[PDB]
Amino acid sequence: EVQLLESGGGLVQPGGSLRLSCAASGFTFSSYAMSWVRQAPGKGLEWVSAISGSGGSTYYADSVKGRFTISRDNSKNTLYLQMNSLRAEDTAVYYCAKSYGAFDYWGQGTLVTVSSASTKGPSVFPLAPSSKSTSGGTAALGCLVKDYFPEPVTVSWNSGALTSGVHTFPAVLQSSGLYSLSSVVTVPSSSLGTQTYICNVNHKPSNTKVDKRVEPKS
Amino acid sequence: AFTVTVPKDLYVVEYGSNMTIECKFPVEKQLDLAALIVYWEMEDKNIIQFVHGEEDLKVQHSSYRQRARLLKDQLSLGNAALQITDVKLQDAGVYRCMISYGGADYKRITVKVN
Amino acid sequence: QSALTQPASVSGSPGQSITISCTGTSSDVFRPPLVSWYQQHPGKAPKLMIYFASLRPSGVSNRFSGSKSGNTASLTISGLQAEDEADYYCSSWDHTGDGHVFGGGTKLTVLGQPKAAPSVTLFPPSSEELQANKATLVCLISDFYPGAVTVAWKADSSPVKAGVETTTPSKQSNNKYAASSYLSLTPEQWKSHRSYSCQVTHEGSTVEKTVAPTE
Ligand SMILES: [Cl-]
């Protein structure tokens, strides 16, 4: 199966540099032209750059000409975007796309945030289930991921073993310029006190990985 | 700059005869048909779809069924050649070839039937 | 400013046709026989629906079709389903045949959806957070439709306008909406009230949850 995995995103200060990579598999990489397409948070798709199958021809949107360079390694099946002289306007999710008449395959994207604000990892606090209001049927417990920058944070439960009934809410950008989110899971009220629930929070920009055990209060 | 060219933009054909119209595209000697897409259309009716190294006849419009074929021996030379057999008066009109092989472009060819 | 022009939004009842138009600002940006269409669901990557104005990739539903007329391209969706709610983008190859341009996108709304009341969950500050001399009340609102709510906080009968941060509602996978509201307070404020309340109003119907230091 065709796979395109982007990597390299994160927080960059304005005027700084970043290199994105896209590992391709499942097709003859050197036979296809490849592109980078970006999307600013909440906005539309913008084509950035294209490169021919051999790497001999490169094309750029006028907004990135002279600052970004597209390249490829046809032996490692990898596509690159070297970004220099970054500006706040370049903040976007960057997608790797295979060109075959049209963009038939896209990667899942990598977020690039160009800002002069400093990184801050989150503080994680459990949202304990109400053993005060037990004997019903379903109980809700969570994880509060507070005061981080920049986006994103990933949250999983029991290292990926618990996926059913999990709802991770979109972050709130507060007036401080910091984000905060919560992840909740509804479980059988009969499970509490016997079943272990741990939220796994990862905030790659700050190298913060936190595991928090959520216990019923009592 | 991917460019498709036509040796002729107009063909005059006799009723009942066979006709072959061509579009040319750049080939880099190490031809990979898995990257080539060839599409032929006449007045919004699908004629040919050569995708993934295979002619997809499942989408062919009724009149062009069993009469229209892409000459696959010419693809390796950079030639998209559409052969239509037993030409009818209804085959007169504007045809277009859309080719993708890295980049993409298209050309129009008019056919007149006597 | 996108080189191609499409409608900002399109709305329509289910089990019905709907057409989104794409057009250019010049020949160097828009060539109808080379138009592609993409579907993008919330938080997901774009998906190719139509290429070469009318060709459908393997896997794409026969309900999706494309056409062209003059200097115009169109995406038609037949037999509208709720799962079709997504953003749609058109794209074209440029005059050179190497670069690309995109339309500004069109948000598709399927108008049949029945009203759903919000499910509200309110959490008090955790003991661990209180130990760090901080306190945050967490109000989680989900499964509501349409996507518009107003949130009000109360400190045992008094409206609280300071320290409140609320998200704009976001579309969930089931096409309903979610939002969250956070109230920041000092541990002293949390312990100096009988209780705190999160009150959410949705289509003139109020859903309230209350939490207290001893509950
Ligand atoms: Cl663009």
PDB file of C-alpha atoms and ligand atoms in Angstrom, chain A residues 45-47, chain C residues 100-102, ligand 1:
ATOM      1  CA  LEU A  45      -4.921  24.488   0.776  1.00  0.00           C
ATOM      2  CA  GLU A  46      -1.968  26.301  -0.840  1.00  0.00           C
ATOM      3  CA  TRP A  47       0.420  24.563  -3.304  1.00  0.00           C
TER       4      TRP A  47
ATOM      5  CA  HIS C 100      -0.734  24.028  -9.323  1.00  0.00           C
ATOM      6  CA  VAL C 101      -3.425  26.332  -7.880  1.00  0.00           C
ATOM      7  CA  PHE C 102      -6.326  25.622  -5.503  1.00  0.00           C
TER       8      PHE C 102
HETATM    9 CL    CL D   1      -2.383  27.498  -4.564  1.00  0.00          CL
END
